[PDB]
């Protein structure tokens, strides 16, 4: 048989944030630390605030290229309020979310997508995982990798998302820590 394509440039990216360490949590959930490993992720996008630099060193260990945006509780003010990073054929924007009013409104997020002109928009602040499509655009919210506390939701589920991009198609994997075992769901999205 013959090869479907000449070479492959697929790359996996890790998305998470709102760890709130050590403000509300001291570290990621035990099973998740086992799920994350260096040499497996080439790109890491962080939305929620670290906020302590100690967490930044941990993210750098999983991958060398890490992109982070300033959250409403980040100690380091040198982080960008929002950033647009291109990953292959996808143009992704990044922002914490506290600047979007109302905080978790979809119409407000969409209005921000236009200004950013990105195919995918990553944001958190609500600590609620969210992955849906709107008007040919994709929106993703990893939530809180440490299930950080949030006055608006009394039941937070810690979780992070990995995105696999082969080319013009992307598959996102979300890991939720429900009960002792970890459950995973698969969602696929493509420019077409």
């Amino acid at each position: 048989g013959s090869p479907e394509f000449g070479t492959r440039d697929r790359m996996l990216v890790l998305v998470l944030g709102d760890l709130h360490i050590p403000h509300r949590c001291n570290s990621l959930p035990a099973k998740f630390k086992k799920l994350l490993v260096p040499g497996k992720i080439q790109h890491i996008l962080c939305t929620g605030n670290l906020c302590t630099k100690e967490s930044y060193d941990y993210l750098k260990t999983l991958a060398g290229d890490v992109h982070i945006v300033r959250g409403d509780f980040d100690e380091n003010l040198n982080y960008p309020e929002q950033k647009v990073v291109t990953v292959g054929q996808f143009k992704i924007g990044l922002i914490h979310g506290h600047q979007v009013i109302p905080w978790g409104d979809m119409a407000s997020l969409a209005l921000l997508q236009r200004q950013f002109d990105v195919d995918i928009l990553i944001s958190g602040h609500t600590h609620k995982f969210e992955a849906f499509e709107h008007e040919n655009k994709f929106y993703i919210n990893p939530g809180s990798a440490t299930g950080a506390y949030n006055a608006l939701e009394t039941n937070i589920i810690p979780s992070f998302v990995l995105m696999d991009i082969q080319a013009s198609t992307v598959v996102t994997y979300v890991y939720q820590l429900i009960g002792d075992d970890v459950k995973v769901e698969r969602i696929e999205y493509k420019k077409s």
Binding site: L14, L35, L36, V37, K40, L162, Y173
Partner: protein, 61 residues
């Protein structure tokens, strides 16, 4: 002798060997298999010598 009168009946003349064959569920899962096999599930026994058999010192008796 043999159940099949045909002299030839081997699907593969030679077998292959490998160190390990880990399976992946999704990104970041270097697990063994994440298979449901656990203490709740029992596997069919297939060992000749095991705890079921014990040894005694003839000189001691």
């Amino acid at each position: 002798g043999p159940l099949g009168s045909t002299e030839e009946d081997l699907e593969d003349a030679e077998d292959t060997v490998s160190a390990a064959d880990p399976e992946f569920c999704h990104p970041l899962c270097q697990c063994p298999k994440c298979a449901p096999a656990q203490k709740r599930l029992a596997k069919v026994p297939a060992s000749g010598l095991g705890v079921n058999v014990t040894s005694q010192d003839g000189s001691s008796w």
